[PDB]
Structure 1
Amino acid sequence: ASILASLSDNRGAYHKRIRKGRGPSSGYGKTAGRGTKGQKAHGHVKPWFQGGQTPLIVSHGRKGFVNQFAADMSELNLEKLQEWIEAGRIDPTKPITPKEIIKSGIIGSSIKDGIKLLGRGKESFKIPVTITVSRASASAIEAIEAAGGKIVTRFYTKESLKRLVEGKSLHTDKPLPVGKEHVEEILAQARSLKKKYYRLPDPTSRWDIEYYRDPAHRGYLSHQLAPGESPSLYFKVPTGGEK
């Protein structure tokens, strides 16, 4: 009659309840599907127990180690970046920075150690954009440039990426200058902002420096090299000839 007296869930949503120990006709009366006077009827058997036989992880042993120092990059392909620009969800005229990549939902809601630009569907990408990420594949760098775009791989961290979305840090495609001839200009720029912004970190380790210091990855530190110099901080390019 009344609406509240005629509401219910779909029939397919309800399922049978098994109340054991409630008679023989129910089907689970006496032993409740346990058997007859065993260890599985009286007590509990450990889950890792195999009767006493040694498990395979002991006769073979565990293989390898789990890398706890690897960066968890948030992958981004070109086929997905093209679909976002065509839908008006990412402005291609403006620089595509992590702040604009995270807020657009193209990589999801989670913020990982970085963003890597991959080249899936690189044959159908012909949009000139100015993107900035933490890494990029060789096939994606040439696709972004073949169409008439610019790509620069900067150094980011899980924390500096959160400050870029929160507005506590301004994005910049250049490292912090070094020398006494830059304090006047750098200090003068901080005052005009009128707000306390956190600076974006720069690479400190050998591998991280060497990554953003080479032109193959379009690193923002590649301008510090010479045409012959190598990115490695230890190795050098040997010389050719007879001497």
Structure 2
Amino acid sequence: AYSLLSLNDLRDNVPRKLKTRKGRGIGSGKGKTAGRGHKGQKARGTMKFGFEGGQTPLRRRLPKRGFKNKFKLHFQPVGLGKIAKLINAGQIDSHELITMKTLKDVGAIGKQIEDGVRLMGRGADEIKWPLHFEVSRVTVRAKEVVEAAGGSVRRVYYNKLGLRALLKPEWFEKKGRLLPKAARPPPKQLDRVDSIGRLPAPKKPIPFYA
């Protein structure tokens, strides 16, 4: 058995638990009506799970509510604490612009971005530098904390195709398409943003009143 790997002594970590074959003799404990009792509907096996006996069920005595919005926007939340931790880890450059592509490449954003990034205020006591951001939405605490250190946050607009072209520019060149052009916001989305995004990923910020 000195490092021997033969087909005669392979076994697992625990012994294998075998099937409970119902309907065998007396000594197995599960024979003659298996585990079904005597007569009725549950011994003949014609019973549907969730039936309530003829009483009007809870799923029909309670009222419906609301409607479904088919144009609902989903933004991925990032806190300031994760961004500060990745700044201190030396993975995010603190002197260049922090776009959404930077967060997607470092991994603060998960696998599927949907409509953009919302900047959150969690871990706001770790921010010690003037950082420049370009996100989709930002909360009041996060904007206040950033501009109290001297940075700026710009709310910027991309659509779905523009987000694909910002994040995966090699996907267009494997397909033979030219890089598209950034689209203007619709009038219901005009007030929520500051400016149209640039479709190459920009690395120099744009000061507001300078």
TM-score under structure 1 length normalisation: 0.69
1:220 to 183, 192, 195: 195
The Cα shift of 1:50 comes to 0.6
1:209 maps to 190
- Larger relative contact order (CA 8 Å, sep ≥ 6): 2
Structure 1 residues without counterparts, runs of 5 or longer: 170-194, 213-218, 222-243
Higher helix share: 1
The Cα shift of 1:66 comes to 3.6
The Cα shift of 1:43 comes to 2.7
SS in 2 for 1:57: helix
Structure 1 residues 166, 52: CA separation in 2 closer, same or farther (over 3 Å shift)?
A: same
2:182 to 195, 200, 217: 200
The Cα shift of 1:22 comes to 2.8
CA distance in 2, matches of 1:31, 1:200: 70
- Deviation digits for residues 61-96 of structure 1 (CA, Å, limit 9, x no counterpart): 223334332111100000111111111221222211
Identity %, equivalent residues: 39
CA distance in 2, matches of 1:59, 1:106: 45
1:6 maps to 9
Runs (4 or more) in structure 1 with deviation over 6 Å come to none
Q: How does 1:29-178 map to 2 (within 5 A)?
A: 29-167=31-169
Q: Which amino acid in the other structure matches residue 157 of structure 1?
A: N
- Deviation digits for residues 30-60 of structure 1 (CA, Å, limit 9, x no counterpart): 2221222221121332223111111123222
CA distance in 1, matches of 2:142, 2:31: 66
Instruction: Confirm or deny: 8 A CA contact 1:82 1:127 kept in the other structure.
Output: no
The Cα shift of 1:138 comes to 0.9
Structure 1 residues 115, 31: CA separation in 2 closer, same or farther (over 3 Å shift)?
A: same
**Over aligned residue pairs, what C-alpha RMSD do you find?**
2.3
Q: How many aligned residue pairs are there?
A: 188
SS in 2 for 1:116: strand
Q: Which amino acid in the other structure matches residue 196 of structure 1?
A: L
Q: How does 1:13-24 map to 2 (within 5 A)?
A: 14-24=16-26
Q: Which amino acid in the other structure matches residue 152 of structure 1?
A: R
Q: Which amino acid in the other structure matches residue 210 of structure 1?
A: D
Structure 2 residues without counterparts, runs of 5 or longer: 172-176, 197-210
Structure 1 residues 111, 45: CA separation in 2 closer, same or farther (over 3 Å shift)?
A: same
CA distance in 2, matches of 1:55, 1:40: 20
